[PDB]
Design a protein around this ligand. Structure first.
Ligand SMILES: CCCCCCCCCCCCCCCCCC(=O)OC[C@H](COP(=O)([O-])OCC(O)COP(=O)([O-])OC[C@@H](COC(=O)CCCCCCCCCCCCCCCCC)OC(=O)CCCCCCCCCCCCCCCCC)OC(=O)CCCCCCCCCCCCCCCCC
Ligand code: HEM
Ligand code: HEM
Ligand code: HEM
Ligand code: HEM
Ligand code: SF4
Ligand code: SF4
Ligand code: SF4
Ligand code: SF4
Lengths: 289, 216, 216
């Protein structure tokens, strides 16, 4: 572990013993998914599985184009389809779903196993499986419901932002494959620029609420979207509006720990000083004099 | 009053108790290892961290089952009554080893009764929240929000119960003669007179009386 | 002479002592983990090796502060005097449990006094060399050569103090009745007569005399 010496966050690691991160002068990268240019071809699902050496089961059709129906340990990205008339005419909104590579990841914050989840200087959040204990805390800590457990090895898996390709200078497999160029990749700074240019074009076409989805509640994401209707992200098969780490999780992983620590220390002190101060309670402390 | 000891705890309740204690050691330590990851050594409570994740909940269930057997056998002796107030008011005096002077103590005192209900309530809370956060078997059926609350509550309940047990062990170590009674089952009449007056008075009467009832 | 026990140690000096012992356990074990890296388990004394590196010196400082409180309260009773020679000459006889026959023992014997100064001198050496080798706070101000000598000396001093404490614990375990006096504060008059003649004679006189001075 830590061979790259650019680990800026590490799960279950005390704040006063930070992970190796001297090689942190690197530009943050990002994937930009422009749903207004997506044709729902699923090429990204196929390219992802092919590159990553994984295959999900052959499922069933239950009335919709969506398939697989959900992310799983063997499907790291899935296209989600939504038909709606909420905006005045029939629209088919199609969105690629998978890890958002949050700047402040809830999965990492909730994880109880040291080093099971890490965040690289470039923004990629990845699972170091040797340390995963299969507790599933990360599934609840994630504001986007992304981590998935593999029944065959009790470990979670998800989109790695093709860390094995990016680490040596190549863009992710899904990015490269996208037929229409709905998916873009590069430094986050220039992806934000491309996103704003696209939003301007959508507004010029009549989408007054077009916008970039890069949620401040999780510190921004390294997988962002350009949405025709940024005022209604739920329309895109439940994309959360203003996502953030849940308050109960923040308290549980935050203040509860040192509070409990103080109680324990204080209790031990009290009991110890108590025994010593007063002495045992035996049958006769009186005939001892 | 002509015997060194009097039976305070039956074998069945002694066997159970020490079974709970052993299971609790493993469950509490594994739980603490997830709570305070810096204490790495505790990740080997069940051998490996991966194994501990699996076994913690199973041993937890066992503790609950055993505590329910304890509940139905001890609850009637742990019922709060007006006679418990005296205790609750001279706590500072009881901690200095002067309880007899200040209270009416039956089978189990007012502190033991509070501990009993605390322990019994927490294991119920831990059972419910534990099942809810249990992967791969049960967490899937619950709304994510419920799972999140359960993660917070379970951690909190687990910590509260561990504090409680620390205090419960201390007291047991403090009011000397107590551990032997839980291991062997017998308490000396003087221990009964000092720490549990009313209680021994009752055995003494039940005793003598029914033997006087026989018709010597 | 009509009491089972006599007070040998005040609560304040008992509280301090056991605070030092707990801190020492952590500091000695963490120190040993750096000294003998093969004993990997000890790298988890403070949870993780990284944490142990940080905390060792802080707990070390706490031990020194506490030992200085002990120094000003016990030093006057640990002063070497001509009466200590007898002890020093029949060491072999003292170790066989026959000290009374061979020496004049006051409050603390000649061995305890040697241990006291050894312990007090070593903690001073450890404090000074410890500060010198302390990164990131202090080592920067010292010439590399001084840091190097301090690394050698600190390791040596730490080992010497640990040996000393091993012997100090053993003796405490060996001269039976001693640990209770440090936990509860009282020693039985017979324990005083056998292991510390002169000392109890003095309390006995101070006692009786001032009570005889009152004017019963
Ligand atoms: C008088 C009142 C005194 C109050 C002091 C309050 C201290 C709070 C410290 C802390 O939490 O600040 C944390 C601070 C902030 O950390 P953070 O990254 O914001 O979050 C912490 C982690 O997220 C998650 O938390 P964490 O995992 O990092 O917890 C930290 C700490 C964790 O340890 C503790 O909090 C206390 C230890 C409690 C153990 C409970 C044992 C209970 C089990 C019993 C079951 C028995 C069964 C019966 C059968 O572990 C280490 O720091 C070393 C402590 C080693 C104690 C060794 C005792 C052995 C004695 C034996 C003789 O960490 C530290 O600065 C070093 C703390 C040093 C304390 C001395
Ligand atoms: C009543 C039966 C119980 C069940 C079903 C249960 C189940 C669980 C589960 C599923 C977890 C998450 C990790 C894992 O999968 O191993 C957990 C964590 C935990 N449990 Fe339990 N448990 C039970 C009893 C207890 C008890 C009696 C205690 C206290 C001694 C306890 C203390 C803890 C703690 C401290 C944690 C970790 C929370 C954190 O990471 O902050 N549990 N338990
Ligand atoms: C090593 C640790 C422990 C020791 C030394 C210990 C000792 C004792 C003793 C001596 C008694 C009976 C005292 C009397 O006769 O008045 C007792 C009762 C009891 N213990 Fe423990 N115990 C320990 C751990 C636990 C744990 C882990 C639990 C459950 C989480 C537990 C639950 C109980 C209960 C329910 C009672 C009956 C009290 C009542 O009915 O009020 N004990 N224990
Ligand atoms: C008086 C206060 C003390 C201070 C400021 C102090 C400081 C230090 C420092 C800074 C180190 C280097 C490693 C690290 O940064 O954790 C160290 C190592 C060590 N200390 Fe201390 N220490 C103190 C007391 C003690 C005591 C009382 C003992 C004996 C129980 C001890 C035994 C050791 C040992 C054996 C080592 C490692 C040397 C090696 O690697 O061979 N220290 N100490
Ligand atoms: C578990 C280990 C220890 C035990 C059982 C223990 C026990 C004792 C006892 C029973 C006494 C008093 C004996 C008497 O009344 O004559 C004593 C005194 C003392 N102990 Fe410890 N001790 C331990 C560890 C330590 C440590 C780690 C230190 C400091 C590094 C320490 C420093 C002292 C000092 C300074 C005295 C006073 C002696 C004098 O004034 O000559 N002890 N200890
Ligand atoms: S490959 Fe591109 S166009 Fe095709 S479904 Fe995925 S994001 Fe949409
Ligand atoms: S989307 Fe979820 S799994 Fe991905 S980085 Fe964010 S919190 Fe973690
Ligand atoms: S399942 Fe998630 S939370 Fe649990 S150890 Fe593995 S990565 Fe961490
Ligand atoms: S970035 Fe890589 S791991 Fe992530 S969805 Fe695309 S192809 Fe799969």
């Amino acid at each position: 572990a830590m061979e790259t010496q650019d680990i800026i966050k590490r799960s279950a690691t005390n704040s006063i013993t930070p992970p190796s991160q001297v090689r942190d002068y690197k530009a943050e990268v990002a994937k930009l998914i422009d749903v207004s240019t997506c044709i729902g071809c699923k090429a990204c699902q196929v390219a992802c599985s092919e590159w990553n050496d994984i295959r999900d089961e052959v499922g069933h059709c239950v009335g919709v184009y969506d398939n697989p129906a959900d992310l799983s340990a063997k499907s790291w990205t899935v296209m989600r389809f939504s038909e709606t008339e909420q905006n005045g005419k029939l629209e088919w909104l199609i969105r690629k779903d998978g890890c958002m590579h949050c700047e402040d990841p809830g999965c990492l914050k909730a994880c109880p196993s040291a080093g099971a989840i890490i965040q690289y200087a470039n923004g990629i959040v990845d699972f170091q499986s040797e340390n995963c204990i299969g507790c599933g805390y990360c599934i609840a800590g994630c504001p986007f419901n992304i981590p998935r457990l593999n029944k065959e090895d009790n470990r979670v898996y998800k989109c790695t932002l093709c860390v094995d390709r990016v680490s040596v200078g190549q863009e992710p497999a899904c990015v490269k494959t996208c037929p229409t160029g709905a998916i873009h990749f590069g430094t986050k700074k220039e992806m934000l620029e491309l996103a704003e240019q696209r939003v301007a074009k959508l507004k010029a076409r009549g989408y007054e609420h077009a916008g970039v989805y890069n949620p401040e509640g999780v510190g921004g994401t390294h997988v962002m979207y350009v949405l025709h209707h940024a005022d209604q992200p739920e329309l895109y098969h439940g994309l959360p509006k203003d996502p953030k780490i849940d308050t109960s999780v923040s308290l549980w992983k935050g203040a509860l720990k040192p509070l409990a620590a103080a109680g324990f220390i204080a209790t031990f002190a009290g009991l110890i000083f108590h025994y010593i101060g007063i002495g045992p309670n035996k049958e006769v402390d009186d005939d001892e004099e | 009053s002509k015997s060194k000891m009097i039976v305070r705890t039956k074998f069945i309740d002694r066997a159970c108790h020490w079974t709970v204690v052993i299971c609790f050691f493993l469950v509490a330590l594994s739980g603490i290892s997830f709570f305070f990851p810096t204490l790495q050594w505790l990740t080997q409570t069940f051998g490996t961290p991966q194994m501990g994740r699996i076994l913690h909940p199973f041993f937890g269930i066992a503790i609950f089952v055993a505590l329910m057997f304890m509940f139905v056998r001890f609850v009637h002796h742990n019922i709060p009554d007006k006679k418990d107030i005296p205790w609750l008011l001279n706590i500072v005096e009881v901690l200095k080893g002067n309880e007899h002077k200040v209270a009416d103590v039956g089978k189990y005192n007012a502190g033991q009764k509070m501990m009993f209900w605390s322990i019994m309530s927490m294991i119920f809370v831990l059972l419910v929240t534990g099942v809810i956060i249990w992967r791969p078997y049960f967490a899937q059926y619950f709304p994510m929000q419920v799972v999140r609350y359960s993660l917070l509550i379970h951690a909190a309940a687990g910590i509260i119960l561990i504090h409680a047990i620390l205090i419960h062990m201390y007291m047991a170590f403090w009011v000397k003669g107590s551990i032997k009674g839980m291991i062997e089952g017998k308490v000396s009449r003087r221990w009964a007179k000092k720490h549990h007056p009313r209680w021994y008075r009752e055995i003494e009467k039940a005793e003598a009386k029914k033997e006087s009832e026989e018709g010597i």
